[PDB]
């Protein structure tokens, strides 16, 4: 049995072909188990509308979760994205660092 | 003006929900101007068929690129990703380790 706890990032986009609307990532990569609980948080609040979950794994043993959706972030919102695994005694937050 | 380099990173990666798939990844990331051409490389030659290309931006000049397509690599092929870019006097070739 292997585990390994998630990286985690948290970064903006802005899609090329409609680089008005802007979305907020949370990539967790190199995980295992695959089970995991993910929250996007402005200011602390869970976000209950996330448009995208795409789930991969590489070896049969590695996942990545990118988990993102469209906002707009004002310069006094804080965004965060909350984890939950096996492998973390805790819920961790990552906040997102606006430059990255 | 500002001019960046892009990262680059070849790696694999399995959708969970069609887990016999292989997509593989170029993943071209920071740079700037946007202006870039890259391919996929199977034993030197350039896939035709590239199914996906996502663009973004983060920064107004931070662009990232996925460039990704199916594949079904067998353990004696090679694939690389090959990318040109003005910071780049000559074409950068990033082969795929497999691992990642
Ligand atoms: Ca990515
Ligand atoms: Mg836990
Ligand atoms: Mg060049």
């Given at each position: ?70 906002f ?17 005694s ?11």
């Amino acid at each position: 049995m292997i585990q390994r706890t998630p990286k985690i990032q948290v970064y903006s986009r802005h899609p090329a072909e409609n680089g008005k609307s802007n979305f907020l990532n949370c990539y967790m990569s190199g995980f295992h188990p695959s089970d995991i609980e993910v929250d996007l948080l402005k200011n602390g609040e869970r976000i209950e509308k996330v448009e995208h979950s795409d789930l991969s794994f590489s070896k049969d043993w590695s996942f990545y979760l990118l988990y993102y959706t469209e906002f707009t972030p004002t310069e006094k919102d804080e965004y965060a994205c909350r984890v939950n695994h096996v492998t973390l005694s805790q819920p961790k937050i990552v906040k997102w660092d606006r430059d990255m």
